[PDB]
Design a protein around this nucleic acid. Structure first.
Ligand SMILES: [Mg+2]
Ligand SMILES: [Mg+2]
Ligand SMILES: [Mg+2]
Ligand SMILES: [Mg+2]
Ligand SMILES: [Mg+2]
Ligand SMILES: [Mg+2]
Ligand SMILES: [Mg+2]
Ligand SMILES: [Mg+2]
Ligand SMILES: [Mg+2]
Ligand SMILES: [Mg+2]
Ligand SMILES: [Mg+2]
Ligand SMILES: [Mg+2]
Ligand SMILES: [Mg+2]
Ligand SMILES: [Mg+2]
Ligand SMILES: [Mg+2]
Ligand SMILES: [Mg+2]
Ligand SMILES: [Mg+2]
Ligand SMILES: [Mg+2]
Ligand SMILES: [Mg+2]
Ligand SMILES: [Mg+2]
Ligand SMILES: [Mg+2]
Ligand SMILES: [Mg+2]
Ligand SMILES: [Mg+2]
Ligand SMILES: [Mg+2]
Ligand SMILES: [Mg+2]
Ligand SMILES: [Mg+2]
Ligand SMILES: [Mg+2]
Ligand SMILES: [Mg+2]
Ligand SMILES: [Mg+2]
Ligand SMILES: [Mg+2]
Ligand SMILES: [Mg+2]
Ligand SMILES: [Mg+2]
Ligand SMILES: [Mg+2]
Ligand SMILES: [Mg+2]
Ligand SMILES: [Mg+2]
Ligand SMILES: [Mg+2]
Ligand SMILES: [Mg+2]
Ligand SMILES: [Mg+2]
Ligand SMILES: [Mg+2]
Ligand SMILES: [Mg+2]
Ligand SMILES: [Mg+2]
Ligand SMILES: [Mg+2]
Ligand SMILES: [Mg+2]
Ligand SMILES: [Mg+2]
Ligand SMILES: [Mg+2]
Ligand SMILES: [Mg+2]
Ligand SMILES: [Mg+2]
Ligand SMILES: [Mg+2]
Ligand SMILES: [Mg+2]
Ligand SMILES: [Mg+2]
Ligand SMILES: [Mg+2]
Ligand SMILES: [Mg+2]
Ligand SMILES: [Mg+2]
Ligand SMILES: [Mg+2]
Ligand SMILES: [Mg+2]
Ligand SMILES: [Mg+2]
Ligand SMILES: [Mg+2]
Ligand SMILES: [Mg+2]
Ligand SMILES: [Mg+2]
Ligand SMILES: [Mg+2]
Ligand SMILES: [Mg+2]
Ligand SMILES: [Mg+2]
Ligand SMILES: [Mg+2]
Ligand SMILES: [Mg+2]
Ligand SMILES: [Mg+2]
Lengths: 146, 100, 23, 62, 54
RNA sequence: CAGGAUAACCGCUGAAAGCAUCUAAGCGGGAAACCUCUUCCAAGACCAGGCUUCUCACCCUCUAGGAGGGAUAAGGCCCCCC
RNA sequence: GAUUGUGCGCCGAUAAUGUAGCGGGGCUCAAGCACACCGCCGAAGCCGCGGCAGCCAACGUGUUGGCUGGGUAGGGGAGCGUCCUGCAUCCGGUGAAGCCGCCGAGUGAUCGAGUGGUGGAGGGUGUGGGAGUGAGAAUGCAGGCAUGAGUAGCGAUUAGGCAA
RNA sequence: CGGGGGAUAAGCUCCGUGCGUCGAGAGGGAAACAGCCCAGAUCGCCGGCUAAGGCCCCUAAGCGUGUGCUAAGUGGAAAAGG
RNA sequence: AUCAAACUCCGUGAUAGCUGGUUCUCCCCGAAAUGCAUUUAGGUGCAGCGUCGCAUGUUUCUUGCCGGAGGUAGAGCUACUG
RNA sequence: GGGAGGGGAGUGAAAGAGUACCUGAAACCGUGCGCUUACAAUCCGUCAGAGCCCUCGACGUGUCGUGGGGUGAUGGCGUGCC
């Protein structure tokens, strides 16, 4: 029969990705694939096989076009006439990490597997992090030529 | 040391001294049968050339004949009155590899 | 109205080759 | 699983299958998957064989 | 009005379970040379012998 | 009241296009509209927050891998007058 | 400078529960459009191995070979189970009939002279004849039992209390 | 597809078509969607090859290759006209 | 306790071009919603469309070639009526 | 123990025959035992699928096997019957 994962064969790892002058779409795609563990050859849909990730310097995220004022993030509390809106510029000005957190959340399955997965991500705004005691491995986005 | 064997239009990974479930092939129990080859793995060397694969041969011993699990089939459509019944079982053969 | 225009316009998807039941 | 293994080994799945077809090796996707989870050295050897068997230019009009 | 459908067995039992009764506390009191248990709400009555005990 | 960024509008410096133009680079003003600023709810916000003080110790059992049971401190609860 | 024909474009754009006229995240470092090229995934389609059935040919007292194998109303053919009976047989206080399990078995309606507990008085196989011979629904009927439910009420216009 | 009744309106009605499908049809394709595209279910197999459509992640496969256009989220709603 | 013709037994299982329900299995084949007529339109007779058998069995169908008559699409007007 | 009702000891083959008395099914209500669930959007099933528990063999403390059973954390699919 095909190989299946046992009780304690799974192993995790620590990764860190910089966000200095990078495109949000590429960053989100890389983060999602790393979270899901598609790279690892021990993929199985039913059990998570993801790997830890660290994102630094969120405020330097670069977005093309006029999206600084023509893209809007909506949400509604629930009472009648409570639909209020915010713009990406103000969102970055106030909460730098909210945009990236929301993007990654939307970039993953919405079932409870993904609900548990999103615990796997930590996102920061400054260039530092108190998680230096676990020796994260730097990572870089690359393309496989074909 | 393990190789790959073709049988019944399909393949199974098998090593020395193992037993696998294979679809029934005409052979008296207790005799030996020769099988073609697909791929051979030996240590750090891998044999992939068609001529070498064809030259190599596989030998195995047939142990017994066995039947698979029973399965029940029903056809059904809504608001038609169509009800259909059908049973079925498959025949299998169990063999033991001898040498490769 | 808006309802009517949608279904007829949505028929112009290349998947269905432009011909669909009920316009 | 095969796509993940090939991407880890730095070659695309489509090119890997093309190389296998060119070399004329008829082993099946299940065999490749099991071998990859079991024998990374064998998987690397097969990948190298496929890369060697690949044509010169994939963009040629041939 | 009236109910529309017969509820589930699990729902029925779950709603039913909470309906119960609670036991009261007891205290040790000595009268006429033997100890017997009575609720604290009747301490003075037991002491003065105004409550009959079987 | 006051502050921040805006719609309608009013602008400064300016080639494409020797001129001109509030604009394609930039810089400005401009409302009960929007965001803080008023009162209240709010850490079941699962990232389940933060600052402090109190006790931080007595046994038994199955078989020593943990778990269960009994006896305690801090505190809480029951009953009683309101 | 102008008229000429062409690919893209901008304005003209406005209804009621919450963006709501790319599926979402999002994408102009195209993941947008046009023209060429190379590849890949993608079904019950085909191919590969095996089981059964219908029609037909060959030779044969069943092997091979060629085609086919979805169905509502409908037509034809072939079957399982239950009862009573003629005939010939076998089982049974050393436990017959139902019921509740385990283990198995046939392509179906199912089967077990294979085994365990309850029971106490008639049953099975073979071949003929006869059926009141096979349920889920008709706001069907006889009997038993579910929720609302330990909820409403406990059937006035006077009213009880105390010692023994 | 070629026609009548209609305001050259209807998911309207009435005709003709060795015309397709559904009705009496599962799968895959277009998010859901009987009447559209491919494709006709004798049964089993943890085997290969493909049509329609797709290849950033949701979701399998190319953030494919070479030459050109786009400043409008046009891509992802429509006409006289400017 | 019911009256635009009371109640009970019978004729009596009064009668419906109308609504409802009709049960165990498998193998093979497999339909129509069209035309004519009807105190006729949600009824029904005949024809076409299915199955089983009998008889003559390729007479069925597609393509190539050959012999055939039409009065549409189009087009035309000192060729007729406008 | 007021009785109702019940426990010993005896009757009898049985009291799983005690006048409510043959054989005692389903709806229905239970007690004990094993597994699972309090961040979750399910015409309540199926295909995969860790852990735990019961069991049949060979090998030893638990580990495999042409092994069976109950539970099911988690992924894909999925619009009742006549
Ligand atoms: Mg139309
Ligand atoms: Mg100027
Ligand atoms: Mg100017
Ligand atoms: Mg907390
Ligand atoms: Mg206390
Ligand atoms: Mg032009
Ligand atoms: Mg516009
Ligand atoms: Mg989209
Ligand atoms: Mg086929
Ligand atoms: Mg046949
Ligand atoms: Mg059939
Ligand atoms: Mg029928
Ligand atoms: Mg029929
Ligand atoms: Mg019988
Ligand atoms: Mg009888
Ligand atoms: Mg006898
Ligand atoms: Mg007896
Ligand atoms: Mg007995
Ligand atoms: Mg008996
Ligand atoms: Mg007879
Ligand atoms: Mg008979
Ligand atoms: Mg008769
Ligand atoms: Mg009868
Ligand atoms: Mg019944
Ligand atoms: Mg009744
Ligand atoms: Mg009720
Ligand atoms: Mg009440
Ligand atoms: Mg009351
Ligand atoms: Mg009264
Ligand atoms: Mg037409
Ligand atoms: Mg018309
Ligand atoms: Mg009509
Ligand atoms: Mg018609
Ligand atoms: Mg059809
Ligand atoms: Mg269909
Ligand atoms: Mg579909
Ligand atoms: Mg078929
Ligand atoms: Mg292919
Ligand atoms: Mg194609
Ligand atoms: Mg993928
Ligand atoms: Mg690209
Ligand atoms: Mg170009
Ligand atoms: Mg658009
Ligand atoms: Mg226009
Ligand atoms: Mg104009
Ligand atoms: Mg009268
Ligand atoms: Mg009378
Ligand atoms: Mg009469
Ligand atoms: Mg009568
Ligand atoms: Mg009558
Ligand atoms: Mg009649
Ligand atoms: Mg009716
Ligand atoms: Mg047919
Ligand atoms: Mg007619
Ligand atoms: Mg002929
Ligand atoms: Mg002529
Ligand atoms: Mg004309
Ligand atoms: Mg004239
Ligand atoms: Mg006795
Ligand atoms: Mg009784
Ligand atoms: Mg009885
Ligand atoms: Mg839980
Ligand atoms: Mg949902
Ligand atoms: Mg499902
Ligand atoms: Mg769904």
């Amino acid at each position: 029969p095909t190989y299946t994962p046992k009780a304690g064969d799974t192993t995790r790892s620590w990764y860190v990705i910089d966000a200095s002058d990078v495109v949000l779409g590429r960053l989100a795609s890389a983060a999602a694939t790393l979270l899901r563990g598609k790279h690892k050859p021990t993929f199985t849909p039913n059990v998570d096989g993801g790997d830890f990730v660290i994102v630094i310097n969120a405020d330097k995220i670069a977005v093309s076009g006029d999206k600084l004022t023509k893209k809007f993030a909506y949400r509604h509390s629930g009472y009648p006439g409570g639909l209020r809106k915010r713009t990406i510029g103000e969102l970055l000005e106030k909460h730098p990490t909210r945009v990236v957190e929301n993007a990654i959340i939307g970039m993953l399955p919405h079932n409870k597997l993904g609900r548990q997965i999103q615990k796997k991500l930590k996102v920061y705004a400054g260039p530092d992090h108190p998680h230096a005691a676990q020796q994260p491995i730097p990572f870089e986005i690359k393309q496989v030529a074909q | 040391t393990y190789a790959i064997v073709k049988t019944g239009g399909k393949q199974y990974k098998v090593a020395a001294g193992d037993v696998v479930k294979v679809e029934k092939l005409d052979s008296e129990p207790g005799a030996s049968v020769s099988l073609p080859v697909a791929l051979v793995v030996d240590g750090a060397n891998v044999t992939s050339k068609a001529d070498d694969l064809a030259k190599v041969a596989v030998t195995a011993e047939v142990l017994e004949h066995t039947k698979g699990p029973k399965i029940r089939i029903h056809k059904f459509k809504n608001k038609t009155g169509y009800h259909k019944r059908q049973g079925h079982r498959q025949q299998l053969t169990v063999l033991k590899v001898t040498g490769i | 109205a808006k309802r009517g225009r949608k279904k007829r316009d949505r028929k112009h998807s290349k998947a269905n080759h432009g011909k669909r039941p009920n316009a | 699983r095969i796509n993940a293994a090939a991407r880890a080994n730095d070659i695309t799945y489509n090119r890997l299958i093309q190389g296998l077809k060119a070399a004329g090796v008829e082993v099946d996707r299940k065999n490749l998957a099991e071998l990859a989870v079991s024998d990374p050295a064998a998987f690397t050897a097969l990948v190298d064989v496929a890369r060697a068997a690949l044509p010169e230019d994939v963009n040629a009009p041939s | 009005a009236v109910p529309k459908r017969r509820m589930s067995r699990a729902n029925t039992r779950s709603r039913r379970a909470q309906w119960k009764a609670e036991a009261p506390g007891l205290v040790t009191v000595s009268v006429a040379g033997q100890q017997r248990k009575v609720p604290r709400r009747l301490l003075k009555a037991a002491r003065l012998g105004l409550v009959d005990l079987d």
